[PDB]
Amino acid sequence: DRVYIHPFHLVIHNESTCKDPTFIPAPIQAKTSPVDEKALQDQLVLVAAKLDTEDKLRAAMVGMLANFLGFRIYGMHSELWGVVHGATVLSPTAVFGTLASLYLGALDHTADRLQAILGVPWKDKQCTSRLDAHKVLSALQAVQGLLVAQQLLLSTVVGVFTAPGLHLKQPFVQGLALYTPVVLPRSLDFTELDVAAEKIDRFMQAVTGWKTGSSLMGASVDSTLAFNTYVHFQGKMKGFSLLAEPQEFWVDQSTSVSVPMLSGMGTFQHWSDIQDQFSVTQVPFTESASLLLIQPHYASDLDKVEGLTFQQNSLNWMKKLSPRTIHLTMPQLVLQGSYDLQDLLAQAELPAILHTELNLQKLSNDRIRVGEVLNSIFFELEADEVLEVTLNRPFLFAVYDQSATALHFLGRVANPLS
Numbered sequence: 001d002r003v004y005i006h007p008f009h010l011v012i013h014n015e016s017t018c019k020d021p022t023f024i025p026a027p028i029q030a031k032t033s034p035v036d037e038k039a040l041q042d043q044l045v046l047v048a049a050k051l052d053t054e055d056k057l058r059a060a061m062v063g064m065l066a067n068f069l070g071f072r073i074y075g076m077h078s079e080l081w082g083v084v085h086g087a088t089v090l091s092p093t094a095v096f097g098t099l100a101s102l103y104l105g106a107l108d109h110t111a112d113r114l115q116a117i118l119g120v121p122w123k124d125k126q127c128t129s130r131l132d133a134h135k136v137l138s139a140l141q142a143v144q145g146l147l148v149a150q151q152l153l154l155s156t157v158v159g160v161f162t163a164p165g166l167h168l169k170q171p172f173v174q175g176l177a178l179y180t181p182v183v184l185p186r187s188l189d190f191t192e193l194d195v196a197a198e199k200i201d202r203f204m205q206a207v208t209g210w211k212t213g214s215s216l217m218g219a220s221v222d223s224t225l226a227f228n229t230y231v232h233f234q235g236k237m238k239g240f241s242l243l244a245e246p247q248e249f250w251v252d253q254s255t256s257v258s259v260p261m262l263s264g265m266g267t268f269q270h271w272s273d274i275q276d277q278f279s280v281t282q283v284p285f286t287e288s289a290s291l292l293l294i295q296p297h298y299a300s301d302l303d304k305v306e307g308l309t310f311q312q313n314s315l316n317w318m319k320k321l322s323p324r325t326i327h328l329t330m331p332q333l334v335l336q337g338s339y340d341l342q343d344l345l346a347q348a349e350l351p352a353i354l355h356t357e358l359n360l361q362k363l364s365n366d367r368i369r370v371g372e373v374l375n376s377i378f379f380e381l382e383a384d385e386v387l388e389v390t391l392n393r394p395f396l397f398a399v400y401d402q403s404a405t406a407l408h409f410l411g412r413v414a415n416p417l418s
C-alpha cells in the first residue's frame with residue numbers, strides 16, 4: 001500500500017524483499033595494506049556515474065534524512081561541542097551511516113528504536129514498515145560518489161574491532177560493503193584498554209595515514225565491540241592561494257593569534273540577514289558542491305547564529321543568496337576531531353539502546369557489549385566594486401551537495417589551530 005505517515009517511501013522494504021557463515025577477524029597487528037584513496041575515489045564516481053534513476057532519488061532522500069537527524073542532535077544539546085574532542089566539526093552523513101550500520105545488525109525493539117532515531121516511523125508492526133538497511137547503506141555510498149563525482153576527495157573507512165573469539169556473521173560485513181568498500185574487521189583484546197587503544201591508533205594511522213587518537217574513553221573492559229567510522233575530506237579552493245604572511249585571528253576581544261590565510265577572488269553567492277545579523281558566503285567546489293561560510297556580524301552572537309544554522313530554515317536561505325563580487329580571506333583549515341554517538345544521542349537514550357536488552361544478533365550470536373561508537377573526522381581545505389569578506393574571527397561552515405541535498409559536514413571554527 002501507499003505510505004502517508006512519512007514521505008520516505010524509497011528507504012523501506014517493498015513487497016518482494018519483505019545457517020550463516022561466521023569468522024574471527026584477523027588480529028589487528030596482522031599486516032594490512034594501506035588504503036588506496038585514489039583508487040577508492042574512482043570507485044565512488046563510478047558508483048555515482050552508473051546510478052539508476054530510482055537509486056539517484058533514494059540518495060537525495062537519505063541526504064535529506066541525514067540533515068534532519070543533524071538538526072535534531074543540535075536541538076537536544078545545551079552544549080554540543082563539549083562532547084566533541086579536538087576540532088568542533090560534525091558529519092551528519094557519517095552519524096546517519098553509523099546508526100544505519102548498527103540498525104543493519106539489529107532486531108526487534110532495538111531495530112525499531114534505532115529506526116526511530118533515524119527519523120522514519122511506522123503505523124504498524126508489518127515487515128514492510130521497517131527500514132531496508134541495504135537500500136539505506138547503498139544510498140549513502142551514492143551520496144559519497146555524488147559529492148566527488150564532479151577538486152574533492154572523500155574517503156570513508158569503517159573499523160569493526162571485536163573481542164578475541166567473537167564470531168562476526170558474514171552477511172553483516174557483506175552489508176557494510178554497501179556503505180563503503182573499505183571495511184576493516186579486526187580482532188582485538190579488550191582486557192588492556194590503554195594498549196588496546198594504542199593498537200587501534202597505530203593500526204588506523206598506518207592503514208590511512210590520518211591521526212585519530214581515541215583512547216577508548218567511554219569503553220570498559222567487559223566491552224566486546226568497537227564500531228568506528230573514519231572519514232577524510234580534502235577540498236580544493238577554486239582560485240585561492242595561500243598567503244606567505246599570516247594574519248590575526250581574534251578568538252576573543254582581548255587575544256588574537258597569527259594564522260595562515262587563504263586568499264581568493266571570484267563571483268560568489270552572498271547574503272546578509274539584517275534581522276538576525278549574519279552573512280552567508282558560498283564558495284563552490286563544483287557546481288552542486290560548495291562551501292557555506294556563516295559569519296555573525298558581531299562575535300557575541302556566535303551561539304545564536306549557530307542556532308539558526310542547525311535548523312531546517314538554514315536550507316531555505318540557499319535561495320536568498322545572490323551573486324556578488326567578493327574577495328574572501330579565511331584561515332587554512334586542517335582539522336581533526338572525534339565524538340561518540342552515545343554522547344551525541346544521550347538525550348535520545350542511545351546509550352540505553354546499546355546496553356539494555358541489546359539485540360544485535362544479526363551482527364553476531366556472541367554476546368555484544370558496546371565499547372564505543374566513534375566518528376573520526378579529518379577535514380582539510382587546500383589552495384589552488386568588490387565586497388571584502390574576512391574571517392578573522394570565529395565563524396561557522398558547512399559543506400553541501402545539491403545532487404543529493406546532503407550536508408556532509410557541519411563545523412565551528414573558534415580557533416584555526418589548537
Ligand SMILES: *[C@@H]1O[C@H](CO)[C@@H](O[C@@H]2O[C@H](CO)[C@@H](O[C@@H]3O[C@H](CO)[C@@H](O)[C@H](O)[C@@H]3O)[C@H](O)[C@H]2NC(C)=O)[C@H](O)[C@H]1NC(C)=O
Pocket residue numbers: 014015016017
Ligand atoms: C524490491 O527492491 C529490491 C531491492 O533489493 C528489488 O530487488 C531487485 O529486483 C531486480 C528486478 O528488477 C533484480 O534484477 C534481476 O536480477 C536477476 C538476477 O537474479 C536477473 O536475471 C534479472 O534479469 C534482473 O536483472 C535484482 O537482482 C534484485 N536485487 C535484489 C538485491 O533483490 C526488487 O525487484 C524490488 N521489488 C519491487 C516489487 O519493487
